[PDB]
Amino acid sequence: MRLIPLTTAEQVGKWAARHIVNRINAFKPTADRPFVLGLPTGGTPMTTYKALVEMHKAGQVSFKHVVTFNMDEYVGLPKEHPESYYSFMHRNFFDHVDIPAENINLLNGNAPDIDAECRQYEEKIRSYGKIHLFMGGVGNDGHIAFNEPASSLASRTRIKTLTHDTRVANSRFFDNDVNQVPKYALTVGVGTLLDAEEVMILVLGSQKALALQAAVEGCVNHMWTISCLQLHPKAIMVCDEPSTMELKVKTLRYFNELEAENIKGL
Amino acid sequence: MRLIPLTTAEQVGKWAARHIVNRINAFKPTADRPFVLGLPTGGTPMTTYKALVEMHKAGQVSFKHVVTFNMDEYVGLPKEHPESYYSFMHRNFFDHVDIPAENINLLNGNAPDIDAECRQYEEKIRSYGKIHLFMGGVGNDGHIAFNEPASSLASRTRIKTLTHDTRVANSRFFDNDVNQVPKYALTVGVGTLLDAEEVMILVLGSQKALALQAAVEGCVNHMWTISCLQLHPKAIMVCDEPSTMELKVKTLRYFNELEAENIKGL
Amino acid sequence: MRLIPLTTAEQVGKWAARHIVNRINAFKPTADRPFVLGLPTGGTPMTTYKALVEMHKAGQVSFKHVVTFNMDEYVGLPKEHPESYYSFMHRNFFDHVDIPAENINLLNGNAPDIDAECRQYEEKIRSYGKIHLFMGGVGNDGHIAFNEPASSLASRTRIKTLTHDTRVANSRFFDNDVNQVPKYALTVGVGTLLDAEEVMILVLGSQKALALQAAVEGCVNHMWTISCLQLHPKAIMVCDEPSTMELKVKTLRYFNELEAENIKGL
Amino acid sequence: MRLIPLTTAEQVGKWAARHIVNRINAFKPTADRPFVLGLPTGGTPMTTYKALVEMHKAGQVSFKHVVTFNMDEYVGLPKEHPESYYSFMHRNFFDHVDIPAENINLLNGNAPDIDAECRQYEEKIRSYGKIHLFMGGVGNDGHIAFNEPASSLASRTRIKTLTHDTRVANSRFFDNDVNQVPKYALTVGVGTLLDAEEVMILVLGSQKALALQAAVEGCVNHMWTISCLQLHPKAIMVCDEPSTMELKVKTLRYFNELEAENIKGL
Amino acid sequence: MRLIPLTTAEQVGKWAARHIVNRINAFKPTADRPFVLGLPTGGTPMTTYKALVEMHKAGQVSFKHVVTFNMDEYVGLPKEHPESYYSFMHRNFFDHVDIPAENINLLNGNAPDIDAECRQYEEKIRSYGKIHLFMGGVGNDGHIAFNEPASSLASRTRIKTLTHDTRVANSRFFDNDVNQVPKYALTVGVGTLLDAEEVMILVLGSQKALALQAAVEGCVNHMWTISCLQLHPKAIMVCDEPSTMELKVKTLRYFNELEAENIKGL
Amino acid sequence: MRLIPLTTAEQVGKWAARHIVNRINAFKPTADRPFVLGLPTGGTPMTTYKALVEMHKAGQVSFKHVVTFNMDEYVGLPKEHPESYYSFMHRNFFDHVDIPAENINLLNGNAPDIDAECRQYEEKIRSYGKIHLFMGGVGNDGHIAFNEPASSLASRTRIKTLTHDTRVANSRFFDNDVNQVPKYALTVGVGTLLDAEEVMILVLGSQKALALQAAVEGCVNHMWTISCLQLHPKAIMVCDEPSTMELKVKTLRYFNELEAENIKGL
Numbered sequence A, B, C, D, E, F: 001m002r003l004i005p006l007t008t009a010e011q012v013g014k015w016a017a018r019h020i021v022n023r024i025n026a027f028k029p030t031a032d033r034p035f036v037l038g039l040p041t042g043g044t045p046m047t048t049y050k051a052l053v054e055m056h057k058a059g060q061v062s063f064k065h066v067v068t069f070n071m072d073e074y075v076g077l078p079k080e081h082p083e084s085y086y087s088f089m090h091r092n093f094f095d096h097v098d099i100p101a102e103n104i105n106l107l108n109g110n111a112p113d114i115d116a117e118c119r120q121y122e123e124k125i126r127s128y129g130k131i132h133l134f135m136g137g138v139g140n141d142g143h144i145a146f147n148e149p150a151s152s153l154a155s156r157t158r159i160k161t162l163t164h165d166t167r168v169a170n171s172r173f174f175d176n177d178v179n180q181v182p183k184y185a186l187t188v189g190v191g192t193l194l195d196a197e198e199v200m201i202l203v204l205g206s207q208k209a210l211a212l213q214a215a216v217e218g219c220v221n222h223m224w225t226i227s228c229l230q231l232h233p234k235a236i237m238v239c240d241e242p243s244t245m246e247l248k249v250k251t252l253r254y255f256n257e258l259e260a261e262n263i264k265g266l
């Protein structure tokens, strides 16, 4: 894997946005061949969405032929709720870019038949062929998407029960009221993510240091599902400074040597 | 994976038997489309076989269209020996249910050409397509079937040399005479097991606590082959109380929350 | 996996050479169906190449229908440099055996288009179908080929940046001048190696003890890429005495019991 | 050690306060033979101080002949400043009980000679003889007061440098401004603490779960200073529920069984 | 420490007995200056007691001036009861040697004041001065007598609660009925043991392999009490073959080389 | 502990030498009150001895009233022999400073009674009182002098057996012939070292990286004797850059911040 050792969240967002833009422009998407982009929500991707929107306004990128798939969504939460991932995505991205409504794909957390909703989501991805770039984040306990500890490393899209710690962490968005945080979520699986051509994970803060250590220096295991990246042929972790504190000196030294030239330029 | 935290061996057997029955009845097997069931031997599955037989006698299940494959068998041990897995299976299951003789598949530990015997076993499974549910147990040192420590995680059916500790453990069935325990066995491989649609492992006793910890909280590795379950899309571990002592409190708490409703009802 | 516990480097070379010879002669290669052999360089395979050459001179083996692929090569290093892997291979093997020039495949570390060179190398392997036996070694830090720490376990042939420690270790061949050691190399990937039918790794010296421990008793992880062997269906590690010092007593005992008969005979 | 597995911080405070009172009254302190109590600050001991104060108000305990020693203080900071441990101790405890000023001992951060003051503090403790009970908390990283990771396990009272993470954890009381949190502070040493007759550590919150695991199931090491308790003949850890989530099931089970009768009524 | 790598329990007993005799005769005890010997119970020391008794019968050693202290006893249990450590010690040792009753020290589980008795036991040891040699065993979980996991490494003689696993391990001598195995017992402490001039631990069986690994290669920690030996200036572990299986090859190799001449003739 | 993160061995030697001089001159030794200095041999302390000698030549320090004790020596080897620690100490230090012969203490490997000599060495140290500063190095496996893995953490001066790896590591000075490297040697103990008022360990080279990690981030254990420093109230590790590569980023970051002003000018 590649690990981009940056300093601030601002830099991480600019780097991630530029990488997405560069992939899209080199791909040259069309109506017959769209660029498929996987997306996450949360506080981590905020600076990236900001940079992407700016780049679009400047005419540096167009999403007219970009199809998106989000990694997850809360179950039972009204779609119109400000904290639903649907709301998050339109507010921070879709509302501001030229992406067609038919090109947007989100999991329906209120679908009557849960397994059916998830199965059709996988079918939708299959209709296109593959996700060219899936961007995501990592949980304090190492989850990728909502693939909580003890989730199959070959899992597909399905419903999952969030850990109490994940609910506490996410309660920051529900007025610090853990009881308002949904208990279940629909999430793409580890296998679903591994099927993507390229995976780019954003990592910010000291709160993510242990998870970054697990992803980079730890072993492949289903407790810290982010470790699945070790099995992916093209994974990139874009990190800020605080997030790298638990890595070994030689490890960070190596990544700094590799990316010295690829980090200076914004 | 799913982990069913039960209390006694009796409960484990009733839960496992019910799961098998439910899978079969929902599948609706026929002569053109049989339900393929993988089976284990040993002291662990005893209460499960007992429950299955009871359920059959009550007309709750029929094996007329169920095809079985056992995971292993001792090499060189006369088929008529009471401790051969062939004898174990007929005595505790086949003799008591309506399963056709042509539907039963067992490895011949006395075959003249070992590799040939194993190859044909894999071919037999392939003739059906796939094993819909493979039930098994776990060794004190973490083996699944007889895939002893340092067995390929992509192994196929083959002959294996048992560890001295495995022979000592199994000597309980040979009048506590380790020298009477066969040194070799034919066993389906880790890859063979991973090809099954669903894997259900029964775990009983304090003697299995370290192996359960390895399977659940440990890393993927070939020393404790049971760790392969982390790579399987549909694995279930059915455990008694003593077997969960080495897990973290938060881990058992999570599984208890998930299965609270699925455990009460027998 | 199989682990052959031998005593000296001489024995390791004789055992590895015999295994290669036996595989080739049983295969019976022809112009329509050649035997594809993957090869390494370095100080480790020296006694093996010596034994192979001797066996060829004695008429025990012919390479007329053997196609070879080397695992790596230094980038930017003149092909004519005595320490290039190209030079190493001709000097220690090709110059002494009846293998056709068209049957030899080596990565061109001075190719103008790096990704293109690597892609065509993979295509060349694909043209044959598969590598029947890939022989290699292991780095002090556990690398297989030049798949340095944090290399994808599903990687393909590509350019890699060597770790400072790898350069120091290899400096022994550049007059102990680390600054003369190339910084980059083209190397087959972990996935490339996993696609081989059989992988045989030679392990010599106390300097490799920690790497052997990682490969055998450690977990699957991308830091010690040699751990990928746990995912391979047919891997063999041929070791000398010093290299086994970090293994557990029971582990070495098991391998000694398994190979007792397969080690005496040269 | 003893570990008291309680549910809430309210229960922890009541248990800890009762223990202090029990020890004080059994000792029956006098002017010539005072009971010496070591004390901590921060949010952790809040429920204990409140409970202890109410016990005093009800006439169950008197501090007329109780001498106290606090574990730390800021250097060069005006004692009057609210963000001083002096201010904390008076506001939350001393202001509300009958302890004489001459019986209160706090490190003077404004001492003319630091190394002289710290020496004097140790001298003062020996002047009485020993601290009969030292109450404390534990940091997220396992620290005790200012004995940060890598502090000698035989350290005495001295000046110390705070970790960046510790400053961030305490910035909460500094208007979330880390720039206001002191970088140094006078603190009793690990050896100083170990010399106490009994040590009682309060553990509250999920943020302390890893530290508790290190203290209870980890090895003795100076990175997690709390591990020092394993070397003490009379240590007690009073915990709430979330702080115990990282412990093994059998560990928590053991302490629950042992203290079942000692936590009734809370 | 010294580790004596022997093969059978018979050899272990002969080596340990000879060591005790060697120490006793070199000391040359008298009425005013007795040799103080600490002793254990259970199945582990059986071959040692038998060998020691035969050495006495042959006139190679006398216990006329040897004072003994046993590590533990049950509380509130009639001394007369066969399942008492008093009964064990007499039946397997005292009944057969010339030690005077006044020289025998066993904790009185029927003491009117437990905390008073334990204190008296420590007092008795100091009355002589010190224990010159303390022989013991090790539990499957690393315990020593009743110093179960999480016992202070500086503990003194006191009352203690047995783990459920310990009770199960000893239920063998209680008709396999755990309900008959006492839940408590008076036991010397880890500190008590460390105060002995020399400590010799007997290690027998595969069931002790993990404990031996913890004692020899693990870190100092109170979960595996046997790790305390690393803090003692004169400790010796006398082991049989199966108990050494979890150690590293280099570890066992080291002790074999060191004691090669010291184990000849057994 | 304090860890001084320097870059080169030249800087390490200058820092360590200056520290020794600072301590000596602050102490102001006299005939009746000498400064006692513990010393090591090998390649590690070379830059320190050279720097110390130049400081003496410049008149910044005198050894007229400095008494020295070296950590070890070979047994039965002629003191005259060049490959003796006596010869090393004089050639690299004593020959160049004004220390009187009567102030030099080295273990006599040719003592008529070894156990008597070692006892005498400890006696000599106590005759002065204590060693004020003991300088040492660390072995690749964490050893200190001859306190090889599995040496008691409370060991005194005694005779010891070297590990095979230690002999190989030192064979460099023995014409690369391990057969010339002694198998035994008289050495001060871990307890002996811990009794010193201050301990300063020099750490140089990538070969010491794992040992440094064990000393700083590992747990107290007798396999890595250097871990004993965690139990000492005044330990200092002076390191070069490559020796710190296995430490965590946050660990090195902490020491760099702490010693930033203390390493300026080197």
Ligand SMILES: CC(=O)N[C@@H]1[C@@H](O)[C@H](O)[C@@H](COP(=O)(O)O)O[C@@H]1O
Binding pocket: A150, A151, A152, A155, A158, A159, A160, A161, B001, B002, B233, B234, B235, B258
């Ligand atoms: C309601 C709910 O939470 N259901 C999930 C199920 O969807 C998931 O498949 C399984 C764990 O398995 P996995 O993570 O390995 O798929 O756990 C639970 O049964």
Ligand SMILES: CC(=O)N[C@@H]1[C@@H](O)[C@H](O)[C@@H](COP(=O)(O)O)O[C@@H]1O
Binding pocket: B150, B151, B152, B155, B158, B159, B160, B161, C001, C002, C233, C234, C235, C258
């Ligand atoms: C007689 C016998 O025991 N043969 C087995 C072989 O069948 C197995 O393939 C290999 C280990 O490899 P695996 O577990 O990775 O297949 O070990 C031994 O050679």
Ligand SMILES: CC(=O)N[C@@H]1[C@@H](O)[C@H](O)[C@@H](COP(=O)(O)O)O[C@@H]1O
Binding pocket: A001, A002, A233, A234, A235, A258, C150, C151, C152, C155, C158, C159, C160, C161
């Ligand atoms: C010039 C160079 O060193 N390029 C390599 C690239 O080829 C490799 O793919 C990646 C790590 O990823 P991998 O080991 O997972 O492929 O690192 C670097 O970008």
Ligand SMILES: CC(=O)N[C@@H]1[C@@H](O)[C@H](O)[C@@H](COP(=O)(O)O)O[C@@H]1O
Binding pocket: D150, D151, D152, D155, D158, D159, D160, D161, F001, F002, F233
């Ligand atoms: C100004 C300052 O911060 N001084 C401290 C010193 O007092 C302490 O002794 C040492 C760490 O060692 P310790 O924690 O092992 O004492 O670090 C620093 O030198």
Ligand SMILES: CC(=O)N[C@@H]1[C@@H](O)[C@H](O)[C@@H](COP(=O)(O)O)O[C@@H]1O
Binding pocket: D001, D002, D233, E150, E151, E152, E155, E158, E159, E160, E161
């Ligand atoms: C009745 C009983 O079981 N009392 C013991 C006590 O004697 C012991 O001191 C403590 C554990 O601490 P220790 O093992 O560290 O002494 O546990 C229990 O309180």
Ligand SMILES: CC(=O)N[C@@H]1[C@@H](O)[C@H](O)[C@@H](COP(=O)(O)O)O[C@@H]1O
Binding pocket: E001, E002, E233, F150, F151, F152, F155, F158, F159, F160, F161
């Ligand atoms: C001749 C010889 O090598 N004797 C040493 C002995 O002096 C040492 O005490 C012990 C290990 O124990 P220690 O390192 O814990 O003292 O090993 C050997 O018996």
